[PDB]
Amino acid sequence: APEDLLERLLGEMELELIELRRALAQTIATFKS
């Protein structure tokens, strides 16, 4: 049922967003050092 996919796909997107969210700080971390 495509409807469940819509919700599921965004959930997978949310994990990547936080994954990218954490990654940016790592770049900032080395910059300060």
């Binding site: 796909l9 990547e16 967003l17 994954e19 990218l20 790592q26 770049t27």
Partner: protein, 56 residues
């Protein structure tokens, strides 16, 4: 002479080792950024793209 010259190699080598470590995370971080950003737009293309948007 041997002890003096060999130390210079060690003195120079150690400086290079940490220098590579500094760039290790820098390139790793950039790779992860693109990797994370690579998929999200692919989902949007598979989700929203008017050609074959699964969403609309």
């Amino acid at each position: 002479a041997l002890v003096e010259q060999v130390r210079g190699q060690l003195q120079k080598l150690e400086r290079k080792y940490l220098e590579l470590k500094s760039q290790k995370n820098l390139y790793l971080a950039r790779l992860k950024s693109a990797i994370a950003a690579q998929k999200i737009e692919e989902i949007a293309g598979n989700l929203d793209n008017a050609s074959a948007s699964s969403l609309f």
